[PDB]
């Protein structure tokens, strides 16, 4: 986006909204 | 070059649309390229709507309305004053 944000460290709220493969470290959304 | 961005028609993701017949000249025109107008008209015009009510055998009869959808082509759509030629920067108006 035009409004640049810090991406080396992401916010905890913004990580949970991104696609599971588009995070800084892709992690599954499944439990158990 | 391109006088219109959508080439006059209104099809984007389909390669073919069935033809329809123009209501004035009967010219085969595509479904999207056609000019579609929906007409609502009472069978009895306003100059004679009260004439029926003076002598009507019923009591609370409400006169119905005619429901016809007219499709024109460009050749007699413009000639019929349904649409007109617009300015170059006024062509984008879509309301």
């Amino acid at each position: 986006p035009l409004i640049e944000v810090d991406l080396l460290n992401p916010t905890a709220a913004s990580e949970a909204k991104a696609h599971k493969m588009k995070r800084l470290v892709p992690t599954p959304n499944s439990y158990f | 070059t391109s006088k219109r961005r959508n080439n006059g028609r209104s099809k984007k993701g389909r390669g073919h649309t069935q033809n329809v017949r123009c209501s004035h000249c009967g010219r085969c025109v595509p479904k999207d390229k056609a000019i579609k107008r929906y007409q609502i008209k009472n069978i009895v015009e306003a100059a004679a709507v009260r004439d029926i009510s003076d002598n009507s055998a019923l009591t609370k009869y409400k006169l119905p309305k005619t429901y016809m959808k007219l499709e024109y082509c460009v050749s007699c759509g413009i000639h019929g004053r349904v649409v007109r030629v617009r300015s170059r920067t006024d062509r984008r108006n879509r309301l």
Binding site: E4, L7, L8, L24, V25, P26 | -
Partner: protein, 129 residues
């Protein structure tokens, strides 16, 4: 498909600096991609970078400060003889005191300023203004 991982990386950095971005992300990180950034850090065209470990050739974040003008890759790496350096400097670089080529040699990745001193040639990876 992805033919050259370096080619897509450099154009990401070139486009980012044209938009004034402060740091950009390159999803793949090969050995040459990291090595190429090391050549551009000695000239102080970038401040520093990082290599996130993702177990799938993790991303790289490049920190840049409005200094990189045009970093580009070169289509299949041509064999640059030592005597042939003058041919490429006069074309690929803007001036004799500004540009910096990048080459790959057996002694590791080197730039044109130092590879001439080491007296060696080899293939060419790209350049940066």
């Amino acid at each position: 498909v992805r033919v050259n991982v370096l080619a897509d990386a450099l154009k990401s950095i070139t486009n980012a600096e044209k938009q004034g971005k402060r740091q950009v992300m390159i999803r793949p990180a090969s050995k040459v991609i990291c090595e190429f950034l090391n050549v551009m850090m000695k000239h102080q065209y970038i401040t520093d970078y990082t290599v996130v470990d993702t177990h799938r050739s993790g991303k790289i974040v490049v920190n840049l400060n409005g200094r990189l003008n045009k970093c580009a890759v070169i289509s299949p790496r041509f064999n640059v003889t030592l005597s042939e350096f003058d041919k490429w400097e006069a074309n690929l670089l803007p001036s004799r005191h500004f540009g910096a080529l990048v080459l790959t040699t057996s002694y590791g990745i080197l730039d044109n300023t130092e590879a001439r001193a080491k007296h060696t040639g080899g293939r060419i990876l790209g350049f940066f203004y």
